């Protein structure tokens, strides 16, 4: 049908149909008379998987023969979404499978909807890991993603009576055709116990043992025949575990609970023992596997270890890799401390994802003492040696010594895991230019002064395979018609589109693709949720995890302003909008749960007011996840990126909207700054305080009452919330929200309100002129190239890992 989806050759289609029928019969044990759409999905998945196998085997054979430096990406989260379409895209099989299934009397898009998301992450950090795996394979790097195979991923969100309810994400119920269990590579992991000192060093004894069983999932590169591996560990009890008899067998669950469930917190640290066990479990199994592969490659020369191994730490979650590597090298391999430390530093690098104090991992010493006694001792020794260096560099500066210590003093002694990561890594990076600068100026200032060479920036990116070709084939096609297909793995080529900004045909085509996407999404909503929207309205979208810093509340204030203005002048023309907000709240985060209730409560009033009509709709998008992002992002006109300046490290949702033809309303925060720089400030809707303005306000003290007193429209909204206008049956329902905004608002919602509302007026003004709206859109798409994760990964490769990317094809 469309060019970018590849060839549908007679031979290919014939073979696909044949193998589909083989799998339905032999694999699924069904015939066409009893088969359901789910059976058909699985028959297709197995058929496509078969095409990965040969390439997967020979890629791994190639790495053994060539013996390149290996890259190990350690993460507690891999937010993968669905795999079927992504695999077809990367293998150039989409059109062929579409034809084959069509000839069998099946709709492929209907089959695609059956696959469960692999929802093994919370949001930005987890999705970054997924985009990174795609780019590393596309760039021919010998890379492995290592994580945990959670039996339950991020919860499914149901909205009941306007409230979030959580349901278990039982994603493995029907099986996972993509993974391959590798019980033969099972490894032991140790917990608890005690440390014994012998004539020949320390020994960690009397431990409890949990087995780590790996499951491997293929990661295909874009049309280069490279297939890399994501290896996820599952927890298993040993067979003599607890071994009255019945209870001992039932108690195996205690060991296996380690890999049971993903902690559903986003940008928030919870110091629970089970989470610490998860962090060590992934680190211990992964490091053993790395060392095994290093020894088996081509007495043991660990001096060359950093030449053949790079370990990237995604946040501090796998920070225990640092003392674990020291433990293995010193206690087991018998290297001297100084040599082991040199190897460790040159091997490890650390990526920071936030500056919010509540997100920083600070583990109580008493927890580490009980669970990991040898690691605590190693951490104390690292700290002593590090502080000896600080004292030599800054003699007499006693406060610097306490500020920089890995051990924090107080009520409970804690270990600062970020301090550990900086000390034990050769590179530390932030994830956008402004964020990386904030790190050097504020929270890691002391460390930057000691070791300036360690600090880098690597601006985040997204993969243009999932986030353009897959989710928006209509846009991919009209671009390819003009500039060819090379841009899919070289996104900077989108700049060529600048020469079409005055092209009347292109303008019409860009706008046509957006309309079609909006129609399709408007239909999706009616079918699956019985919600009814006007597809001719401006689609105003804010999708991301619910958090006070992201300021969904500022969006709510604007929505109520628009409603109040309509009620004041009902017969005045306004540009129609559909305001869509979606995202999950952490189950324990009360204020985020209250914000969801507020959004639905506003919808309850606005959507049923006869005077409003179809001029304003407010919709909460339930169960926001990767597969939903792929649907809504291509349909969006306006992307809301409105975090308080200095709080969103980078953002990546922002980049997805830019690539897909939405304009951005945003603060100068995270990557928004670089996006505006690339496109031109005149092609962005920037408003509000800059970081420096927030700093000034903090200095004199933020007083929300001042804004309430001086802005009549703001006062009206607060009075409506307080008096029960949006909750008639429970007048005081939103008291906590009002109290927070008036007395305890860390994120200064009122301070950006006036400029936000005015900027929104400018958006509505431009939308009234379709031609100029679309020309600005083209200027955004054309300059989105920098935000490909291929660019990001090439920078990590050259500046941190010391490896060269390759666009060269492996033989098919």
Does residue 266 touch ligand DK4 according to CB under 6 A?
A: yes
293 annotated to a ligand binding site: yes
Radius of gyration of the chain (CA): 27
Chain positions 30 to 49 lying near a copy of itself, rule: CB under 8 A, are 30-31, 36, 38
Question: Which of a copy of itself, ligand DK4, none interacts with 155 (beta carbon under 5 to 8 A by kind)?
Answer: a copy of itself
27 exposed, middle or buried (CB, 10 Å; 0-12, 13-18, 19+)?
Answer: middle
Catalytic (active site) residue 729: no
146 annotated to a ligand binding site: no
Q: Which residue is associated with the tokens 């003004």?
A: 765
Per-residue x/- marks for a copy of itself, 536-575, CB under 8 A? Answer: ----------------------------------------
Does residue 649 touch ligand DK4 according to CB under 6 A?
A: yes
Residues with Cβ within 8 Å of 312's Cβ and at least 6 positions away in sequence, in order, are 71, 72, 73, 74, 349, 351, 796, 800, 801
3-state secondary structure of 125: helix
Catalytic (active site) residue 317: no
CB nearer ligand DK4, residue 123 or residue 785: 123
3-state secondary structure of 217: strand
Report d(CA 453, CA 349) in Å as an integer.
13
Does residue 548 touch ligand DK4 according to CB under 6 A?
A: no
31 annotated to a ligand binding site: yes
Does residue 155 touch a copy of itself according to CB under 8 A?
A: yes
Shortest Cβ distance from residue 314 to ligand DK4 (Å)?
A: 9
Please, what is the angle between helix 590-606 and helix 735-743, to 10°?
A: 110
Catalytic (active site) residue 465: no
- Tell me the sheet residues that pair with 416: 362
Residues in the chain: 812
Residues with Cβ within 8 Å of 520's Cβ and at least 6 positions away in sequence, in order, are 635
**Segment contacting ligand DK4 (CB under 6 A): 35-43, 80-88, 121-129, 579-587?**
121-129
Question: Which of a copy of itself, ligand DK4, none interacts with 128 (beta carbon under 5 to 8 A by kind)?
Answer: ligand DK4
| 6 C-beta neighbours (distance < 10 Å), count | 19
Determine the straight-line distance between the first and last CA of the chain, rounded to whole angstroms. Answer: 25
Closest by Cα among 234, 325, 319, 320 to 287: 325
Shortest Cβ distance from residue 121 to a copy of itself (Å)?
A: 17
CB nearer a copy of itself, residue 38 or residue 532: 38
CB nearer ligand DK4, residue 115 or residue 648: 648
Catalytic (active site) residue 69: no
Shortest Cβ distance from residue 73 to a copy of itself (Å)?
A: 22
**Distance from the Cα of residue 606 to its chain's centroid:** 33
Question: Which of a copy of itself, ligand DK4, none interacts with 460 (beta carbon under 5 to 8 A by kind)?
Answer: ligand DK4
Does residue 18 touch a copy of itself according to CB under 8 A?
A: no
In the set 45, 80, 106, 128, which binds ligand DK4 (CB under 6 A)? 128
Shortest Cβ distance from residue 545 to ligand DK4 (Å)?
A: 7
Q: Assess contact for 83 and 626: CB atoms under 8 A.
A: no
**Segment contacting a copy of itself (CB under 8 A): 251-259, 465-473, 663-671, 773-781?**
251-259
**Segment contacting a copy of itself (CB under 8 A): 6-14, 255-263, 735-743, 777-785?**
255-263
In the set 267, 463, 517, 683, which binds ligand DK4 (CB under 6 A)? 267
Does residue 26 touch a copy of itself according to CB under 8 A?
A: yes
Shortest Cβ distance from residue 550 to ligand DK4 (Å)?
A: 9
Question: Which of a copy of itself, ligand DK4, none interacts with 175 (beta carbon under 5 to 8 A by kind)?
Answer: a copy of itself
Catalytic (active site) residue 442: no
In the set 7, 67, 168, 567, which binds a copy of itself (CB under 8 A)? 168
DSSP state, residue 205: E
299 annotated to a ligand binding site: no
Q: Assess contact for 538 and 637: CB atoms under 8 A.
A: yes
| 696 C-beta neighbours (distance < 10 Å), count | 11
In the set 72, 263, 684, 773, which binds a copy of itself (CB under 8 A)? 263
Does residue 152 touch a copy of itself according to CB under 8 A?
A: yes
Q: Out of 51, 55, 236, 353, which one is annotated catalytic? A: 353
In the set 128, 261, 340, 522, which binds a copy of itself (CB under 8 A)? 261
Q: Assess contact for 88 and 111: CB atoms under 8 A.
A: no
- Tell me the sheet residues that pair with 159: 164
CB nearer a copy of itself, residue 250 or residue 498: 250
- CA atoms lying within 13 Å on the CB side of residue 39: 16
**Segment contacting ligand DK4 (CB under 6 A): 151-159, 330-338, 351-359, 790-798?**
351-359
Q: Assess contact for 456 and 422: CB atoms under 8 A.
A: no
Helix H or strand E encompassing 456: strand 455-457
Backbone angles phi, psi at 689, to 5 degrees: -60, 140
- Tell me the sheet residues that pair with 73: 145, 312
**Distance from the Cα of residue 170 to its chain's centroid:** 20
Token digits for 26?
């032999």
Report d(CA 141, CA 797) in Å as an integer.
9
3-state secondary structure of 271: coil
Does residue 53 touch a copy of itself according to CB under 8 A?
A: yes
295 annotated to a ligand binding site: yes
Report d(CA 725, CA 602) in Å as an integer.
9
Backbone angles phi, psi at 443, to 5 degrees: -65, -30
Does residue 116 touch ligand DK4 according to CB under 6 A?
A: no
Closest by Cα among 93, 107, 99 to 41: 107
Q: Which residues of 150-187 are buried (b: 16+ CB within 10 A; e: fewer)?
A: bbbbbbbbebeebebeeeebebeeeebbbbeeeeeebb
Does residue 245 touch a copy of itself according to CB under 8 A?
A: yes
Shortest Cβ distance from residue 318 to a copy of itself (Å)?
A: 20
Report d(CA 580, CA 555) in Å as an integer.
10
Does residue 588 touch a copy of itself according to CB under 8 A?
A: yes
Token digits for 140?
């021919």
In the set 18, 32, 194, 272, which binds a copy of itself (CB under 8 A)? 272
Residue 6 Ramachandran class (φ > 0 left, ψ -120 to 50 alpha, else beta): left
> Strands 143-148 and 70-74, how do they pair?
parallel
Does residue 644 touch ligand DK4 according to CB under 6 A?
A: no
112 exposed, middle or buried (CB, 10 Å; 0-12, 13-18, 19+)?
Answer: middle
Q: Out of 465, 550, 597, 786, which one is annotated catalytic? A: 550
Shortest Cβ distance from residue 158 to a copy of itself (Å)?
A: 9
**Segment contacting ligand DK4 (CB under 6 A): 100-108, 119-127, 556-564, 584-592?**
119-127
Report d(CA 209, CA 256) in Å as an integer.
11
> Strands 685-686 and 156-160, how do they pair?
unpaired
Question: Which of ligand DK4, a copy of itself, none interacts with 263 (beta carbon under 5 to 8 A by kind)?
Answer: a copy of itself
Q: Out of 5, 414, 544, 748, which one is annotated catalytic? A: 544
Catalytic (active site) residue 656: yes
Does residue 353 touch ligand DK4 according to CB under 6 A?
A: yes
Give the binding-site size for ligand DK4 (rule: CB under 6 A): 19
Does residue 774 touch ligand DK4 according to CB under 6 A?
A: no
**Segment contacting ligand DK4 (CB under 6 A): 33-41, 116-124, 487-495, 600-608?**
116-124
Residues engaged in binding ligand DK4 (CB under 6 A): 122-125, 128, 266-267, 315, 353-354, 359, 431, 460, 648-652, 670
Annotated binding site: 31, 64, 292-298
Annotated binding site for AMP: 31, 64, 292-298
Q: Which residues are catalytic?
A: 353, 544-545, 550, 652, 656
Residues engaged in binding a copy of itself (CB under 8 A): 25-26, 29-31, 36, 38, 50, 53-54, 56-57, 152, 155-156, 165-168, 170, 173-175, 180-181, 183-184, 236-237, 239-241, 243-246, 249-250, 252-253, 257, 260-261, 263-264, 272, 274, 587-588
């Amino acid at each position: 049908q469309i060019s970018v989806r590849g060839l549908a050759g007679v031979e290919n289609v014939t073979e696909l149909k044949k193998n589909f029928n083989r799998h339905l019969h032999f694999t699924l044990v069904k015939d066409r008379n009893v088969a359901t759409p789910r059976d058909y999905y699985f028959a297709l998945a197995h058929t496509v998987r078969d095409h990965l196998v040969g390439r997967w085997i020979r890629t791994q054979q190639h790495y053994y023969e060539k013996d390149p430096k290996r890259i190990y990406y350690l993460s507690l989260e891999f937010y993968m979404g669905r795999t079927l379409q992504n695999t077809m895209v990367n293998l150039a099989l989409e059109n062929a499978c579409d034809e084959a299934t069509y000839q069998l009397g099946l709709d492929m898009e209907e089959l695609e909807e059956i696959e469960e998301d692999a929802g093994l992450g919370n949001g930005g950090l987890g999705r970054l890991a997924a985009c990174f795996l795609d780019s590393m394979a596309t760039l021919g790097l010998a890379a492995y993603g290592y994580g945990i195979r959670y039996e339950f991923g991020i919860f499914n969100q149901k909205i009941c009576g306007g409230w979030q309810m959580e349901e278990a994400d039982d994603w493995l119920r029907y099986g996972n055709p993509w993974e391959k269990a590798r019980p033969e590579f099972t490894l032991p992991v140790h917990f608890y116990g005690r440390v014994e000192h012998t004539s020949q060093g320390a020994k960690w004894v009397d431990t409890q043992v949990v087995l780590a069983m790996p499951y491997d999932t293929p990661v295909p590169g874009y049309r280069n025949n490279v297939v890399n591996t994501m290896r996820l560990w599952s927890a298993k009890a040993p067979n003599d575990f607890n071994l009255g008899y019945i209870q001992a067998v039932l108690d195996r669950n205690l060991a296996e609970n380690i890999s049971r469930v993903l902690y559903p917190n986003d940008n928030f640290f919870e110091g629970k023992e089970l989470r610490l066990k998860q962090e060590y479990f992934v680190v211990a199994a992964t490091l053993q596997d790395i060392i095994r592969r290093f020894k088996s490659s081509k007495r043991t020369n660990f001096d060359a270890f950093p030449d053949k191994v790079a370990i990237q730490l995604n946040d501090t979650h796998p920070s225990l890799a640092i003392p674990e590597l020291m433990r293995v090298l010193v206690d087991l391999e018998r290297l001297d401390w100084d040599k082991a430390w040199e190897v460790t530093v040159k091997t490890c690098a650390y990526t920071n994802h936030t500056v919010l104090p509540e997100a920083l991992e600070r583990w109580p010493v008493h927890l580490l003492e009980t669970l990991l006694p040898r690691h605590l001792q190693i951490i104390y020794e690292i700290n002593q040696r590090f502080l000896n260096r600080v004292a030599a560099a800054f003699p007499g500066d006693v406060d610097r010594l306490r500020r920089m210590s890995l051990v924090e003093e107080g009520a409970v002694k804690r270990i600062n895991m970020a301090h550990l990561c900086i000390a034990g890594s050769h590179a530390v990076n932030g994830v956008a230019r402004i964020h990386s600068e904030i790190l050097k100026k504020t929270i890691f200032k002391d460390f930057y002064e000691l070791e300036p060479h360690k600090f880098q920036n690597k601006t985040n990116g997204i993969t243009p395979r999932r986030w353009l070709v897959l989710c928006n084939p209509g846009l991919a096609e009209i671009i390819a018609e003009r500039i060819g297909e090379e841009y899919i793995s070289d996104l900077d080529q989108l700049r060529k589109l600048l020469s079409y900004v005055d092209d009347e045909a292109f303008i019409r085509d860009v706008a046509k693709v957006k309309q079609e996407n909006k129609l399709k999404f408007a239909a999706y909503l009616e079918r699956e949720y019985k919600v009814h929207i006007n597809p001719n309205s401006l689609f105003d979208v804010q999708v991301k995890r619910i958090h006070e810093y992201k300021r969904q509340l500022l969006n709510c204030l604007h929505v109520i302003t628009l409603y109040n203005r309509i009620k004041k002048e009902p017969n005045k023309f306004v540009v129609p909008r559909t305001v869509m907000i979606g995202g999950k709240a952490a189950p324990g985060y009360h204020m985020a749960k209250m914000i969801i209730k507020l959004i639905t409560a506003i919808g309850d009033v606005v959507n049923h007011d006869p005077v409003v009509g179809d001029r304003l709709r407010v919709i909460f998008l339930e169960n926001y996840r990767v597969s939903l992002a792929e649907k809504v992002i291509p349909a969006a006109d306006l992307s809301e990126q409105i975090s308080t300046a200095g709080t969103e490290a980078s953002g990546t949702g922002n980049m997805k909207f830019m690539l897909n033809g939405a304009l951005t309303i945003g603060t100068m925060d995270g990557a928004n700054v670089e996006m505006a720089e690339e496109a031109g400030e005149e092609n962005f809707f920037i408003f509000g305080m800059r970081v420096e303005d927030v700093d000034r306000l903090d200095q004199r003290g933020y007083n929300a009452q001042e804004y309430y007193d001086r802005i009549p429209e703001l006062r009206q909204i607060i009075e409506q919330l307080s008096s029960g206008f949006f909750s008639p049956k429970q007048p005081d329902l939103f008291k906590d929200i009002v109290n927070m905004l008036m007395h305890h608002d860390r994120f200064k919602v009122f301070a950006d309100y006036e400029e936000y509302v005015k900027c929104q007026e400018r958006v509505s003004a431009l939308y009234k002129n379709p031609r100029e709206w679309t020309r600005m859109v083209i200027r955004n798409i054309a300059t989105s190239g920098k935000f490909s994760s291929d660019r990001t990964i090439a920078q990590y490769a050259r500046e941190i890992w010391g490896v060269e990317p390759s666009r060269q094809r492996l033989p098919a």
